[PDB]
Each structure stands twice: as C-alpha cells, then as structure tokens.
C-alpha cells in the first residue's frame, strides 16, 4: 500500500494528492 | 505538511483533509 510509503518512509503533500480521490 | 510520517488514521486524517470534499483514497487491506 501507500501507508508505509508515507509512514515508515515519508512523502510530500504532492504524493498524498496522487493518493486522493 | 513537509516530510510527514502518516500511517493508519494519521494517514486517513491527512488523506481525509488533503482531498476532503475532493474525496480521498486509502489502503485498508482486508
């Protein structure tokens, strides 16, 4: 998934955007 | 939010906000 992708590793808001609706 | 560690709710929280009215997406593997 993308969870650890942003949790264990860290991500920017532009990525959480790609994971938005 | 610069460099953020989001997992479980912490991710849904931001997820819920990054998009919000724009709806968001999550893993919820089960």
Name the descriptors:
heterodimer, A: 21 residues, mainly alpha, 0% strand, Insulin A chain (chain A), hormone/growth factor, Thr-B12-DKP-insulin, protein unfolding
Structure description:
The complex is a heterodimer of chains A (21) and B (30). Chain A is 48% helix and 0% strand. Chain A is mainly alpha-helical. The radius of gyration of chain A is 8 Å and the shape is flat. Chain A has helices at residues 3-6, 13-18. Chain B is an all-alpha fold and 30 residues long. Helix content of chain B is 37%, strand content 0%. Chain B has one helix at residues 8-18. Chain B is flat, with a radius of gyration of 10 Å. At the A-B interface, helix 1 and helix 2 of A face helix 1 of B.
List the helices and strands and how they pair.
The complex is a heterodimer of chains A (21) and B (30).
Chain A: H1 3-6, H2 13-18
Chain B: H1 8-18
Brief sketch in words of this structure:
The complex is a heterodimer of chains A (21) and B (30). In chain A, 48% of the residues lie in helices and 0% in strands. Chain A is mainly alpha-helical.
Radius of gyration of chain A: 8 Å
Order of helices and strands of chain B: H
Summing up helix and strand content along with how strands pair, one would put the structural category of chain B as mainly alpha
Shape of chain A: flat
Number of helices of chain A: 2
Question: How would you characterize the largest beta sheet of chain A?
Answer: none
Instruction: Name the helicity range of chain B.
Output: 25-40%
General form of chain B: flat
Alpha-carbon distance between the termini of chain A?
15 Å
Radius of gyration of chain B: 10 Å
**Percent in helix of chain A:** 40-55%
Q: Name the chain pair whose interface involves the most residues.
A: A-B, 16 and 21 residues
Total strand count of chain A, please? Answer: 0
The H-and-E topology of chain A, N to C, reads as HH
Q: How is the main sheet of chain B built?
A: none
Q: Separation of termini of chain B?
A: 29 Å
Relative strand content of chain A = under 5%
Organism (chain B): Homo sapiens (Human)
Protein name (chain B): Insulin B chain
């Amino acid at each position: 998934g993308i969870v650890e992708q942003c949790c264990t590793s860290i991500c920017s808001l532009y990525q959480l955007e790609n994971y938005c609706n | 939010f610069v460099n953020q560690h989001l997992c479980g709710s912490d991710l849904t929280e931001a997820l819920y906000l990054v998009c919000g009215e724009r709806g968001f997406f999550y893993t919820k593997p089960t």
